[PDB]
């Protein structure tokens, strides 16, 4: 198909973009990650949850007002007991906790946030639009949504948490699955604006301003 000059032409072309990007990177090119995300790459197996405690408490008299997670359940295979052992008691003193629960673990998570001492009160429901419905193989029913369980503990009667401000229904697409809708952080803002946030088991696409994101893929 006469392509020695074809394959040699793409090489020097592809090398130019490297040469281009590797220059822009040196020209102060901005990545998409906002300038207030606090990304921490670690494995929650080996992390010191007193280094994150001692720091935040010092650089902010508060603790975390909202806690997110989307843990990975063995069905990158993190065991059920080792997630239950993450000291979430000491990271959060007063606020809410948002944890995403797939259907195989929907009951597991309710047990999970209760041993940590919270109190189930709500559940966000993220239905999937085709662009307006999802098809998911379930053993008993077709799955068309994922749930994000909401627990709470402490005094939320402060003005720090705007009550009656967000819904339980979300209508985003299946963007880059497994990725969660960005509308959650907007809801966490309407609930609790300008506050200390935490998102365990997060990725590049989860970084936001004021969000402390922990995840071994950052």
């Amino acid at each position: 198909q006469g392509l020695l000059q074809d394959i040699e032409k793409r090489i020097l072309h592809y090398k130019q973009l490297f040469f281009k990007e590797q220059n822009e990177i040196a020209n102060g090119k901005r990545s998409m990650v906002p300038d207030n995300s606090i990304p921490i790459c670690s494995d929650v197996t080996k992390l010191n949850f007193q280094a994150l405690i001692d720091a935040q408490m010092r650089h902010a008299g508060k603790m975390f007002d909202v806690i997110m997670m989307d843990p990975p359940w063995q069905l990158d295979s993190l065991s059920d007991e080792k997630i239950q052992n993450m000291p979430i008691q000491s990271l959060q003193q007063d606020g809410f906790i948002f944890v995403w629960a797939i259907n195989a673990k929907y009951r597991v998570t309710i047990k999970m946030i209760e041993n940590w001492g919270y109190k189930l009160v709500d559940e966000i429901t993220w239905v999937k639009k085709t662009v307006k419905i999802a098809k998911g193989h379930g053993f008993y029913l077709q799955h068309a949504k994922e749930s994000c369980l909401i627990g709470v503990k402490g005094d939320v009667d402060n003005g720090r948490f705007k009550k009656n401000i967000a819904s339980d229904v979300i209508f985003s697409e299946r963007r880059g699955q497994s990725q969660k809708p960005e509308e959650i952080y907007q809801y966490i803002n309407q609930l609790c604006p300008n506050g200390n946030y935490l998102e365990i088991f997060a990725r590049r696409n989860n970084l936001h301003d004021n969000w402390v994101s922990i995840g071994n893929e950052l």
């Binding site: 130019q16 040469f19 990545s31 720091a55 590049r204 004021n210």
Partner: protein, 125 residues
């Protein structure tokens, strides 16, 4: 906005050396490239320093020492950035010095300007 210094301090307090720049601002350079393929500032020093004594074309010899991981074949590829030339086939197999590199650039970076053959900050052949 005090969230800036709060974001500035907490990044300094806990983030890996790569993810956070010494001043404390987010260093996007690591975030722009996928995975842990970002070439550490230390790694660049390591390649500059490994390359001069070992020499170009010694990649089979080159991989074994300085870069603990198996480096991508790129060592040829990255070197071009140091030498400011799209085709290092002229410089290949010649062992160089750690100081010689920059002199090579200024001439080619100048030549490519009078040759109009300068793109992306590196002499294009």
């Amino acid at each position: 906005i005090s969230r800036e210094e709060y974001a500035k301090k907490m990044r300094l307090a806990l983030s890996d050396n790569h993810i956070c720049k010494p001043d404390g601002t987010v260093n996007h350079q690591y975030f722009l490239v996928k995975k842990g393929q970002y070439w550490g500032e230390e790694k660049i020093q390591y390649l500059i320093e490994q390359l001069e004594k070992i020499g170009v074309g010694n990649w089979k010899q080159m991989q074994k020492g300085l870069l603990e991981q198996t480096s991508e074949i790129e060592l040829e590829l990255r070197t071009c950035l140091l030498f400011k030339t799209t085709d290092i086939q002229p410089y290949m197999d010649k062992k160089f010095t750690k100081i010689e590199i920059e002199q090579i650039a200024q001439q080619n970076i100048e030549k490519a300007q009078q040759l109009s053959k300068l793109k992306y900050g590196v002499f294009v052949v």
